[PDB]
Amino acid sequence: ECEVTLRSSDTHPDGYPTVEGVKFMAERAKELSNGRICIEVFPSSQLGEEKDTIEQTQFGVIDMVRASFGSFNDIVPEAQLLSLPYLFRSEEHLHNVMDGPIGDELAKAFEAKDLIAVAYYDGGSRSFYNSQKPITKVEDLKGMKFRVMQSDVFVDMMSALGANATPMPYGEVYSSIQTGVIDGAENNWPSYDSSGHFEVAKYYTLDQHLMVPELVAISKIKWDALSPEDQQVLRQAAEESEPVQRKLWAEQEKASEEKVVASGAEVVREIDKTPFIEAMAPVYEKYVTKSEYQDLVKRIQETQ
Numbered sequence: 616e617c618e619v620t621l622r623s624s625d626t627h628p629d630g631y632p633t634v635e636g637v638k639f640m641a642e643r644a645k646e647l648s649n650g651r652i653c654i655e656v657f658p659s660s661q662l663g664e665e666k667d668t669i670e671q672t673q674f675g676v677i678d679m680v681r682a683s684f685g686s687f688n689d690i691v692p693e694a695q696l697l698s699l700p701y702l703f704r705s706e707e708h709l710h711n712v713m714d715g716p717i718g719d720e721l722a723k724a725f726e727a728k729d730l731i732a733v734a735y736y737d738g739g740s741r742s743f744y745n746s747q748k749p750i751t752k753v754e755d756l757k758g759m760k761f762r763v764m765q766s767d768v769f770v771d772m773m774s775a776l777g778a779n780a781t782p783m784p785y786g787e788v789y790s791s792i793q794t795g796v797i798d799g800a801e802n803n804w805p806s807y808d809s810s811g812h813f814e815v816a817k818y819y820t821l822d823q824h825l826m827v828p829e830l831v832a833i834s835k836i837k838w839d840a841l842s843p844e845d846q847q848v849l850r851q852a853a854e855e856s857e858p859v860q861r862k863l864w865a866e867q868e869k870a871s872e873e874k875v876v877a878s879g880a881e882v883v884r885e886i887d888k889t890p891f892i893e894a895m896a897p898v899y900e901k902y903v904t905k906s907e908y909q910d911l912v913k914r915i916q917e918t919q
């Protein structure tokens with residue numbers, strides 16, 4: 616048994632939808648391989664913060680990782696491109712993009728950087744939360760200090776809004792907010808909840824400026840050393856976990872919103888997003904640098 620073992624990393628805790636997703640993938644891969652293939656999940660950043668685990672996965676030290684496109688920065692340039700603000704209209708839109716040929720194009724981009732993309736997971740939309748004041752309009756962000764994920768595109772996004780970005784690993788955000796070093800950060804409801812940030816940043820504004828895709832990626836080095844039979848099992852188990860993870864995600868979006876609101880989170884709803892969207896013009900100008908990227912963005916916006 617467990618002749619083929621794979622260590623899989625996630626920054627999130629046990630019980631979180633992405634972790635439950637890979638745990639389901641692991642149960643299925645074990646069943647389908649008659650006990651041969653054994654995926655072990657290491658949650659809560661046990662093996663390191665997310666960007667660091669991505670690099671260790673590329674080197675084959677970690678076998679598999681569940682990660683946000685936003686943690687890649689320049690490592691996979693099209694991953695950064697798909698982290699542009701207000702690129703996707705909805706979770707349905709994003710599903711149709713990632714499920715179609717654009718998803719295959721991105722898979723090729725990951726493979727060129729020694730990562731085999733076997734599933735795309737849902738991460739919903741990200742919105743601003745802070746400890747200082749309600750954000751009711753773009754102008755309220757002026758001069759404020761917000762953590763972002765470690766990609767240049769998010770630093771530029773904050774500058775476009777007249778604020779100051781500070782990239783840092785997810786695990787350090789809570790203390791930085793708590794001690795007042797930064798004013799806030801931005802994320803989806805389940806992160807805002809499970810991270811504890813709602814305890815130290817009670818103001819949340821549903822500006823929904825990002826929908827950053829996520830993936831399960833296997834080390835290409837480890838993958839290439841597997842038999843075709845074992846590769847087939849992994850891909851099957853990964854694809855099976857996708858609809859499952861999507862449903863777990865939808866349920867947790869609801870539960871976490873309810874939870875944090877029950878705890879006193881002060882939420883601003885119905886914000887006019889138009890000025891937020893307009894402000895992103897320079898960001899698109901800076902990152903949409905080609906034909907290859909221009910047409911990509913175009914085909915995304917054209918996807919129903």
Ligand SMILES: O=C(O)[C@H]1O[C@@H](O)[C@H](O)[C@@H](O)[C@@H]1O
Binds near residue numbers: 738
């Ligand atoms: O802000 C972050 O770093 C985290 O945001 C969450 O939404 C992602 O699911 C996670 O992969 C990122 O590490």
